Amino acid sequence: NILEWLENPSNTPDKDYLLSIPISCPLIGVIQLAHYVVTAKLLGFTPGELRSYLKGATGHAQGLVTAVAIAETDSWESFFVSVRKAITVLFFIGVRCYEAYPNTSLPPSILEDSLENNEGVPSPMLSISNLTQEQVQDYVNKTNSHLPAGKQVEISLVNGAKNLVVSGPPQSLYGLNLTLRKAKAPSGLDQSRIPFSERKLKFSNRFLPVASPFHSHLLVPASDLINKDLVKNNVSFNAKDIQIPVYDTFDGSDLRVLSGSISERIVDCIIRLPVKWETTTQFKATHILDFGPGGASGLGVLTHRNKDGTGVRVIVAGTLDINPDDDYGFKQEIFDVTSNGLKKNPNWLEEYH
Amino acid sequence: MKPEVEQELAHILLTELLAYQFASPVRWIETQDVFLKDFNTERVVEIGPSPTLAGMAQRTLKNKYESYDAALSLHREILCYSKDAKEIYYTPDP
Amino acid sequence: SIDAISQVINIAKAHPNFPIALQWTGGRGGGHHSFEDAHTPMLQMYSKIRRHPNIMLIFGSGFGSADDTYPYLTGEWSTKFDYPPMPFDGFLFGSRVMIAKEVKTSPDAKKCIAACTGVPDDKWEQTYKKPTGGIVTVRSE
Amino acid sequence: ELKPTVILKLLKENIIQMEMIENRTMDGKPVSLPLLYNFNPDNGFAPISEVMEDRNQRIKEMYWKLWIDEPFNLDFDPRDVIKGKDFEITAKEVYDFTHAVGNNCEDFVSRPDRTMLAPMDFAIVVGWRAIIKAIFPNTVDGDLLKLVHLSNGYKMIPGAKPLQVGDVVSTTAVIESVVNQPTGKIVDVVGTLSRNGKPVMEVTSSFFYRGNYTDFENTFQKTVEPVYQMHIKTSKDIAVLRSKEWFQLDDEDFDLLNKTLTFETETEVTFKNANIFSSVKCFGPIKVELPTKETVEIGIVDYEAGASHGNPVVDFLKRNGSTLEQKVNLENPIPIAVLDSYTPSTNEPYARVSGDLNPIHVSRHFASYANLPGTITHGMFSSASVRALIENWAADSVSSRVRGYTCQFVDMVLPNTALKTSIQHVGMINGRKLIKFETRNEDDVVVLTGEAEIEQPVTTFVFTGQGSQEQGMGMDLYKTSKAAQDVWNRADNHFKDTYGFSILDIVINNPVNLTIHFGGEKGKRIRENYSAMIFETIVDGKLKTEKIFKEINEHSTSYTFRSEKGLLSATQFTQPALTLMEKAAFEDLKSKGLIPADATFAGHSLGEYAALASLADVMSIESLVEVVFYAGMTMQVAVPRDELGRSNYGMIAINPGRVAASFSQEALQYVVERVGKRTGWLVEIVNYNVENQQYVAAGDLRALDTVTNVLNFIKLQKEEVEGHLFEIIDEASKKSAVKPRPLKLERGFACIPLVGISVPFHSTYLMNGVKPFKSFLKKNIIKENVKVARLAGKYIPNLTAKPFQVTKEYFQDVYDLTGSEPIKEIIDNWEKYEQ
Numbered sequence A: 001n002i003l004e005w006l007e008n009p010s011n012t013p014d015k016d017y018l019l020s021i022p023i024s025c026p027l028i029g030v031i032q033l034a035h036y037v038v039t040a041k042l043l044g045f046t047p048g049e050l051r052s053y054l055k056g057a058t059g060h061a062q063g064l065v066t067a068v069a070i071a072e073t074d075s076w077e078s079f080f081v082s083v084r085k086a087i088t089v090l091f092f093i094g095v096r097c098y099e100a101y102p103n104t105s106l107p108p109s110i111l112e113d114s115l116e117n118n119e120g121v122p123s124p125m126l127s128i129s130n131l132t133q134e135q136v137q138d139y140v141n142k143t144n145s146h147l148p149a150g151k152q153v154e155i156s157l158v159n160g161a162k163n164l165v166v167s168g169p170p171q172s173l174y175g176l177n178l179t180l181r182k183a184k185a186p187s188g189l190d191q192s193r194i195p196f197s198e199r200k201l202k203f204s205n206r207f208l209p210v211a212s213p214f215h216s217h218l219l220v221p222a223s224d225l226i227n228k229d230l231v232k233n234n235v236s237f238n239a240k241d242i243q244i245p246v247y248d249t250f251d252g253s254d255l256r257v258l259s260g261s262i263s264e265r266i267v268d269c270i271i272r273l274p275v276k277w278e279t280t281t282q283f284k285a286t287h288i289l290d291f292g293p294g295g296a297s298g299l300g301v302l303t304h305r306n307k308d309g310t311g312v313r314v315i316v317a318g319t320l321d322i323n324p325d326d327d328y329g330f331k332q333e334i335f336d337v338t339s340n341g342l343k344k345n346p347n348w349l350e351e352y353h
Numbered sequence B: 001m002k003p004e005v006e007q008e009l010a011h012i013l014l015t016e017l018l019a020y021q022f023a024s025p026v027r028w029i030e031t032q033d034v035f036l037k038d039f040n041t042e043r044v045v046e047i048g049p050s051p052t053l054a055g056m057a058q059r060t061l062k063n064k065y066e067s068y069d070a071a072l073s074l075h076r077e078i079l080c081y082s083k084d085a086k087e088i089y090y091t092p093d094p
Numbered sequence C: 001s002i003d004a005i006s007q008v009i010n011i012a013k014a015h016p017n018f019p020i021a022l023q024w025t026g027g028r029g030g031g032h033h034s035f036e037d038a039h040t041p042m043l044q045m046y047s048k049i050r051r052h053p054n055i056m057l058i059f060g061s062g063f064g065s066a067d068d069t070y071p072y073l074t075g076e077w078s079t080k081f082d083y084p085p086m087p088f089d090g091f092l093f094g095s096r097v098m099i100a101k102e103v104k105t106s107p108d109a110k111k112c113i114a115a116c117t118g119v120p121d122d123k124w125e126q127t128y129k130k131p132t133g134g135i136v137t138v139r140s141e
Numbered sequence D: 001e002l003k004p005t006v007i008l009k010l011l012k013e014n015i016i017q018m019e020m021i022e023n024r025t026m027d028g029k030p031v032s033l034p035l036l037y038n039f040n041p042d043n044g045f046a047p048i049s050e051v052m053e054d055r056n057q058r059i060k061e062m063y064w065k066l067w068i069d070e071p072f073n074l075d076f077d078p079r080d081v082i083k084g085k086d087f088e089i090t091a092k093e094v095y096d097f098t099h100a101v102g103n104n105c106e107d108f109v110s111r112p113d114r115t116m117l118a119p120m121d122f123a124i125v126v127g128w129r130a131i132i133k134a135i136f137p138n139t140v141d142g143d144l145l146k147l148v149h150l151s152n153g154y155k156m157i158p159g160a161k162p163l164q165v166g167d168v169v170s171t172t173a174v175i176e177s178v179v180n181q182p183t184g185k186i187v188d189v190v191g192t193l194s195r196n197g198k199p200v201m202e203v204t205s206s207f208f209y210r211g212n213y214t215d216f217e218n219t220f221q222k223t224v225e226p227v228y229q230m231h232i233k234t235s236k237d238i239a240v241l242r243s244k245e246w247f248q249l250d251d252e253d254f255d256l257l258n259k260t261l262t263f264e265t266e267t268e269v270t271f272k273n274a275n276i277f278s279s280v281k282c283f284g285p286i287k288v289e290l291p292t293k294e295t296v297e298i299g300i301v302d303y304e305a306g307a308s309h310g311n312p313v314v315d316f317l318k319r320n321g322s323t324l325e326q327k328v329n330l331e332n333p334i335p336i337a338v339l340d341s342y343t344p345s346t347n348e349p350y351a352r353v354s355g356d357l358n359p360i361h362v363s364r365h366f367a368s369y370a371n372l373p374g375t376i377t378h379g380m381f382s383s384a385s386v387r388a389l390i391e392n393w394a395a396d397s398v399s400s401r402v403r404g405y406t407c408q409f410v411d412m413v414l415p416n417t418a419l420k421t422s423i424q425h426v427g428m429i430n431g432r433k434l435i436k437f438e439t440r441n442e443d444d445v446v447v448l449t450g451e452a453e454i455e456q457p458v459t460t461f462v463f464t465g466q467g468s469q470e471q472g473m474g475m476d477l478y479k480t481s482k483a484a485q486d487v488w489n490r491a492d493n494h495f496k497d498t499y500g501f502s503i504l505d506i507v508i509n510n511p512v513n514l515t516i517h518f519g520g521e522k523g524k525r526i527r528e529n530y531s532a533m534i535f536e537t538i539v540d541g542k543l544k545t546e547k548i549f550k551e552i553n554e555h556s557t558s559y560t561f562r563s564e565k566g567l568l569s570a571t572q573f574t575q576p577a578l579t580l581m582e583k584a585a586f587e588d589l590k591s592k593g594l595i596p597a598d599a600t601f602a603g604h605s606l607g608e609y610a611a612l613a614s615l616a617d618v619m620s621i622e623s624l625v626e627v628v629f630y631a632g633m634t635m636q637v638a639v640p641r642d643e644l645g646r647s648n649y650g651m652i653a654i655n656p657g658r659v660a661a662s663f664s665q666e667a668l669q670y671v672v673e674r675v676g677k678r679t680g681w682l683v684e685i686v687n688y689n690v691e692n693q694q695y696v697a698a699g700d701l702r703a704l705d706t707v708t709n710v711l712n713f714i715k716l717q718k719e720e721v722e723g724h725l726f727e728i729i730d731e732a733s734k735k736s737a738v739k740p741r742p743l744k745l746e747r748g749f750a751c752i753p754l755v756g757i758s759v760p761f762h763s764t765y766l767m768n769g770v771k772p773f774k775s776f777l778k779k780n781i782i783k784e785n786v787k788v789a790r791l792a793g794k795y796i797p798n799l800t801a802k803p804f805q806v807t808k809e810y811f812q813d814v815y816d817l818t819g820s821e822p823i824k825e826i827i828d829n830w831e832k833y834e835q
């Protein structure tokens, strides 16, 4: 009951329950759709013509559903049907994935060790930064060699060259984290006097705020149930109805030209296949509007860091804030009518040609 | 197997093991592998005046059971009677 | 290093009008040198440097021809590091011009310099252990 | 939705009926409790009078309809055992129960490629229909609306795996004790849950019928009295025991003097009134403590009496013997965590999953009629929630690690209340941590309090071998621990009586020389003990019998043990001292209750003997020290020693890691074998200690010198390979051979000679002496004292470094390393032994 939670913040549930995926998936969908509605209304656009202005659409795992929905949107009259499609898909993937791999209480010994090692609460998704994919993969394989098949960990989100996310059991990810801590240097280790080759690699691993291990073998049994549930509470995305390219999370291919069911492919992208965000980021665009959650901590700044120096400006459409560096936009840049609204990110190959 | 026959067999086997123990090499590699990997021993207690076997078990763990320990989150607490009496007795210092 | 580059960036920020020539040089450069790689600090700090137009980026520490300097001129040196192109504003040639006719280096010292075969970038760090490429690292006062 | 809850009417001109309808039922059909009241207009002040006749029967009938799904029949003996219907554990049921109690442990949640366990609290769900049937009989009369659940407890029997999804569990309830107290009637029910015939666990449940009851003829009480220990010091004690009729012995001539008797009695009392028992019976087995600390039945307590004011047996045992408390408190409690739980807004989720449809937990009107502060929640829910917290925190979210859990419901708990539970580790019981908890409500009022027996983490006990002996070993434990005192004193007394020396004194003072004197009858007996000591060796099929202490004869007035620096470093005294201080440390641990029942154990060298005497109690302290002292003294004659007492044998500690990274266990074994074979002398690896980081090689001092030299050479440098290694061996051997026989092994860059060792034990050299040593070990280790349960799965022998198992594969493994005729006979005749 979200209306009551919004009207009375006092009796809202706790953050862990809200973060649980059967809540988080549909509610992150609502947040993204609300950002889209605010943008379109304040610009005086119908969702269809705003989509037509958009060169393309895509999403990080969950946001792909919203991307396809706003891709299919036509007008305010039929905008709620696409909202219903997106919200139903998100609700069902959340419910079925939670059923497939619910959240259990981790050993408080593990929790205390993680906390005293300047680490957050263990979660089914662990983000690792400043490590190459091959290095993260060898660590994952070393951990998987000992773990059994049902408790394996695999890379879920290839956010960037030096940014990855490994999904699996929280306990298995804590074991991987123990190995990484064994292989990790202190942050405050002054290595300026050591040769670059001889320097011990340093990286940062932190558990994401997630409640289920997305893009893992663990949520695979949920996929068929989600597909059948969509066919029952009919939510189908048709290539003909979609009128802008939607870039796949796995291979970056447009979802329109896919022979198979777009809804089924989306579900596999969220639950089974990993997200190769760089491989999706091959589209040629000058401006990227990030409607996701997190604001400054959301997908927009990550995409900006990936695409920095290529002449692509990212605008965080969901937050009103000032970026001191002015290397990425905010909600005001979308609605600004002066030359301030039109900000082109530097392209090093051109500007410093 | 009847209980009495089982006892007789076990007594003969134990006698023979003890009899050949002083004439045959000590396979403490296999013993450590058995009680660290097959049983996943979480706490080792070493009954001795010095932490000899405790240091040996520690060495086996750093040399061999490191990725195993990390992956399966086995808190291998190696305690020796001579120095880790507080840990063995559950008498933490207030 | 990174801290020094950040300090240069702070100076440029404090004086956004005055031109600052950031003469980056990796550890592989001749004479006094650091332990830092010639490339990764630049891959890390290039965007911050270009956020200030009054900074001019000059690359040194291991350049002695136009063939090996053109990739840094166009910025395509970063494409092999999987970064966007990273054009550089200038270059400096310290060890190349040591055997030039107008330097006061003695003829035998010039012959000794020319005898140094040199090594690629990836194996310059061996100078800390052995005379790699005819050149070795030593500690000053 | 809205459904009828009460119907008030008149059945006749006088009977007012209040049908209190519970709509929450097993089959969904409403069940009406009719409460009848006489209406007397003549008595205008109080016209309405409760109809007591059949009131308790009606309440019981309605509760039976709600709880039990069998035809209503209250006429059955409370003594008779109640058999509950066979119940099948399902994933859905475990799912619902876990999410109703708040059990988030991963053990109970379905996971891929892993069997789903059921919570310990699920036992009450399995056995409610019998445990609650216990309190129904008309003989145990009482108002069920006034029932109070005083306490509930779970106890897994040892060796029983936790409940798992799919197993079929049978429940057998018995009324342990029903007693009329002034404030009400206590009824204690014990429900045994069994699986595949074997028992799984026991569920105790105490119920209180508040009211006044005088039907003592139907009251009885069975109590397992605490175990009592009595040391028989004098013949007065024996006379007092024999004067007791109840004290009966199978062997009337059994020698009770200097013996410890343990009494495990159970008292069954039937009451005549509140104070006086109508009949008192006290029955149990009396057992004696053997030298191996093993209690074996030698008699029985059998007391029977009619009207009596008490049980004289328990009074006598309390006054004379001492109570053995299995639980052992720590020096100070150890707080674990203070946790906040919340009682649910409704009790239907727990009621429908546990089967407890008590209306006081779901219906406002029934609670009002029961005078409760509100729709109070299941105490069993609170117990399940606290046990979830305990297995999460005390047990680190390991279901199997929780073996016992008792809880007392001191106060009622209302829904939507914050319960603060402080968990403390207060003691140990048979190697299980005893955890107290005290759950209080928001008003700082205790509402739950109980115990939890949580198994320790998987424990192994590794007993150290010779090498670390030092003066003052185990003496602080000898000062403090009483069990260590007893072990050391038994050892010292045996050594004084037999060989006339004090192992305690040797450990404390480390004398360089020790003179045993053979004056008087005691000295002559000690001299005979010394002369009887022989070293028997079957060499080349001939049983040589060398004599240890060849000096000692009938005319020897004294013998003197010599040492260079101290006698505690001599194998004769080093091994018994080490074995004794190990056994004393373990015995103090056992007295403190820190030994898990399932703990495994191994021992390096003598360490094995100490581990056997410690965990398995195969041999007593006396036999242990006898065997170990005999072995240590046979070492003195096992190797030909020169006139200076030094032999040409020893040991070195090789480190394959410090010679070269290439050097592995296989490489070192290859080099050692080639050294021995090519040079002709004896050398071999005796202790495989650490992988490529610590090994021991025993053999000739000269040969070990060549091994050290060759490994030094391999450190200094990097069929045909065999010939090259042979050349290195030849160089080292021709360099070392010319040295005098009593040479000193030099420290290599990787070889560390071991000081104080002059015999190559654990080597092929002492194979001829195994059989006579085996016979001596048989004389010392009695078959009856070997406990297969204590040894199997826990003992890892050094010969066969696998868990001890009496199996044909294990016996064949014994031959695979060392062939022996009895083993081959056993394997050949195995089909005969199994039958």
Ligand SMILES: Cc1cc2nc3c(=O)[nH]c(=O)nc-3n(C[C@H](O)[C@H](O)[C@H](O)COP(=O)(O)O)c2cc1C
Residues within 6 Å of the ligand: C025, C028, C029, C030, C031, C032, C033, C060, C061, C062, C063, C092, C093, C094, C095, C096
């Ligand atoms: C002989 C010699 C003297 C140098 N003296 C200085 C100096 O005095 N101050 C300084 O900042 N760098 C000095 N350098 C470093 C160079 O100026 C330049 O920064 C870079 O390291 C040269 O790189 P390269 O040898 O690969 O061409 C010297 C280099 C050489 C070879």
